[PDB]
């Protein structure tokens, strides 16, 4: 095309671009110049690469640098009629499509760096093509918008001992187990759906800025942790054996409904509490759990065995809405980024390793697939508020609180040969469960 | 053949994952796919005995702090990892070890202390003395050069064998 006063015209070679060999070519690695050339290629559209590049590029190119490179790509120096029609026009359009996708789907780059947006608006003001007026206007409309800030009838809310409005009596045994599961599933589905790819790519939730870069993810994990700890505390603070057995049974019924809702985060919240050192050792309590409820917990725990083999199969087999367990994605993203080189070298030259970026984008893409579909369930504001405000640790630090739970376990069921004390009841109301069959 | 269930534990960012990946990878292949079994299961020969190592590395899930008991309960022996440039990760080790003993309901759990290689803030002598006070081996590694990686996992396998005998 052009001579080499346009860096993107340098011929492909093994030392600037590598393709995957296992429709559109898939780039395994390239110089950033070749990546941006193929991102805005003249011979074909590549929407998948546009999506994965704009999701992952900040690990190998700063936002200001990317804008400079795409403006350089657009400003092509000049049969010349053929060149304009077959090279300049299609590349320029492709560039504008990348700009539009960038401001539409990754506007946080501009929110964090106001000068990046100034440069973008200045660049768009230079594009005069009569053809490109529609792209110009479309991009301006999105920018102006960004700068400004039940499918079916839901079933009846279920109630047990606590009556509507009596917030102050809400507790694990007094709310209805169906409704505890429903309201935790709505809360956990909302927390899951709020996590954005910018909180994940680059493993930024593991780095020193994690609280500013991954707030929604961390809020979600802290809810899961607090619910697991609340289940543990409810169990070990119930000193009387029959009452405790009723508490463990009720948590397993909540687990049964989590499974019916495909809320795997809730399933794991229960499984983790039952695996915890203060709970797992309670021989006398588990002995009294009905066999049919043992079976429910047994099948849930088995989802985690063998590196989550049965979990992964079950998730692939159900239909949304669902709430995935996020921790698997986190380990896979982290290991994908740490286990593959940042750059490949070829006859002395460095190429950006884009395949590991693509692999991370495939994970964030699966996360996003499960975020589309909401639950057809009605919120109950007081119950939602009760769970949003759970704080089982109180004022204690992690170590002090988990030592408290374990000492409570040793008090309520002492180690052999020490004798098993009897303990007074604490629950004034009936322990019988209403079950987990809904009304109508 | 004998299978060993190993669990890697430690603070965020100390190189748990790099150690595991460097163990599993064939030496000159730099392409890791964590979604398949061969990424965490490896057949090796140690002191003449051939075995299968199954390594549970949950790096990236450190914020799920109430799931540690569940993960630790799956294991036979533990690699307790800290970063030699990160003093807090070394101070955390005591808490991981106490949590493991509680989960395993045992005072002698097969375990190896690993200090993985900014500059050094934890003295070799301090880590050796801590390991000695626990009755366990200490091994320094550099996941990046692969130095000490096999020694760390094989030493843990040896500890598991000594415990079963």
């Amino acid at each position, epitope marked *: 095309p052009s001579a080499d006063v346009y860096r993107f015209a340098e011929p492909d070679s093994e030392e600037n671009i590598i393709f995957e060999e296992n429709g559109i070519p898939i780039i395994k690695a390239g110089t950033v110049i070749k990546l941006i050339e193929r991102l805005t290629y003249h011979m074909y559209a590549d929407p998948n690469f546009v999506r994965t590049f704009l999701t992952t590029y900040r690990s190998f190119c700063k936002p200001q640098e990317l804008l400079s490179l795409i403006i350089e790509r657009f400003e092509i120096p000049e049969e010349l009629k053929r060149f304009r029609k077959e090279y300049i026009q299609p590349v320029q359009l492709r560039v504008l499509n990348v700009c539009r996708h960038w401001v539409e789907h990754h506007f946080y780059d501009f929110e964090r760096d106001a000068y990046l947006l100034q440069r973008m608006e200045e660049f768009i003001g230079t594009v005069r093509g009569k053809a490109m007026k529609k792209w110009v206007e479309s991009i301006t409309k999105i920018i102006q918008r960004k700068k400004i800030a039940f499918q079916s009838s839901p079933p009846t809310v279920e109630w047990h001992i606590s009556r509507p409005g009596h917030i102050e009596t809400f507790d694990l045994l007094t709310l209805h187990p169906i409704e505890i599961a429903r309201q935790l599933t709505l809360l956990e589905s909302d927390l899951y759906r709020a996590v954005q790819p910018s909180e994940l790519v680059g493993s930024v939730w593991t780095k020193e800025d994690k609280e500013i870069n991954s707030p929604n993810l961390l809020k979600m994990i802290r809810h899961t942790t607090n619910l697991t700890l609340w289940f543990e505390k409810c169990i070990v603070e119930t000193e009387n054996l029959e009452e405790r057995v009723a508490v463990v049974s009720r948590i397993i019924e909540i687990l049964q409904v989590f499974q019916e809702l495909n809320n795997f985060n809730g399933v794991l919240e229960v499984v983790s509490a039952m695996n915890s050192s203060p709970v797992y050792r309670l021989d*006398h309590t*588990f002995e009294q759990i009905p066999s049919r409820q043992k079976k429910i917990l047994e099948e849930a725990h088995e989802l985690s065995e063998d590196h989550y083999k049965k979990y992964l199969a079950k998730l692939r087999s159900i239909n949304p809405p669902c709430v995935p367990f996020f921790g698997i994605y986190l380990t896979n993203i982290l290991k994908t980024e740490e286990g593959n080189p940042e750059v490949l070298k070829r006859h002395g030259k460095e190429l950006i390793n884009f395949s590991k970026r693509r692999k991370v984008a495939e994970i964030t893409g699966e996360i996003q697939q499960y975020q589309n579909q909401p639950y057809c369930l009605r919120v109950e504001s007081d119950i939602k508020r009760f769970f949003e405000n759970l704080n089982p640790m109180g004022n204690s630090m992690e170590k002090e609180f988990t030592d408290y739970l374990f000492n409570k376990s040793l008090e309520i069921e002492p180690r052999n040969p020490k004798p098993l004390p009897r303990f007074p009841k604490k629950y004034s109301y009936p322990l019988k469960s209403p079950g987990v069959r809904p009304s109508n | 053949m004998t299978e060993y269930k190993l669990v890697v534990v430690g603070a965020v960012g100390v190189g748990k994952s790099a150690l595991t990946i460097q163990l599993i990878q064939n030496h000159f292949v730099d392409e890791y796919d964590p979604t398949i079994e061969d990424s965490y299961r490896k057949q090796v020969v140690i002191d003449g005995e051939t075995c299968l190592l199954d390594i549970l590395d949950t790096a990236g899930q450190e914020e799920y702090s109430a799931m540690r008991d569940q993960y630790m309960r799956t294991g036979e022996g533990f690699l307790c990892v800290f970063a030699i440039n990160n003093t807090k990760s070394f101070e955390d080790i005591h808490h991981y070890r106490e949590q493991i003993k509680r989960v395993k309901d045992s005072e002698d759990v097969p375990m190896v202390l690993v200090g993985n290689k900014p500059s050094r803030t934890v003295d070799t002598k301090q880590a050796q003395d801590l390991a000695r006070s626990y009755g366990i081996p200490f091994i320094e590694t550099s996941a990046k050069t692969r130095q000490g990686v096999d020694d760390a996992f094989y030493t843990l396998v040896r500890e598991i064998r000594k415990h079963k005998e």
Partner: nanobody, 118 residues
Framework: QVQLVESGGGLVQAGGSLRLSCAASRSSFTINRMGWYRQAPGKQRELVADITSGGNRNYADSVKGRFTIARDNAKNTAYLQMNSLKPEDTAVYYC????????????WGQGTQVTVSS
């Protein structure tokens, strides 16, 4: 894929003693509960004795005072000391393991004949 390997058993005079032994083959952590069940001709299989990793035990009423169960947690082995055997103790005896406190799935040994002659 844990397997339970039984040993002991066989023929013994009434009034005498036998020790049954059970060893789990391939396990990564302490089996929560190990025990023995038996099945006499014409009868259902019934619990004889079991013991948790925390040392809590159950004995069938018909063997209390005569049979003792013991285990070695670290080794996932257990044994059953059967004293003052009676012809009614003749049965196939099975080692049993429940992996977790919520386990309902059974791991069973192959079964060991015990025949008490009078």
């Amino acid at each position: 894929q844990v397997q339970l390997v039984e040993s002991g058993g066989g023929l013994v005079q009434a009034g005498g003693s036998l020790r049954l032994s059970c060893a789990a083959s391939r396990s990564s952590f302490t089996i929560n509960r190990m025990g023995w069940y038996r099945q006499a001709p014409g009868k259902q299989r019934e619990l004889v004795a079991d013991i948790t990793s925390g040392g809590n035990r159950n004995y069938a009423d018909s063997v209390k005072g005569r049979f003792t169960i013991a285990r070695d947690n670290a080794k996932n082995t257990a044994y059953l000391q059967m004293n003052s055997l009676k012809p009614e103790d003749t049965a196939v005896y099975y080692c049993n393991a429940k992996i977790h406190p919520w386990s309902v799935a059974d791991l069973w040994g192959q079964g060991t004949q015990v025949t008490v002659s009078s």
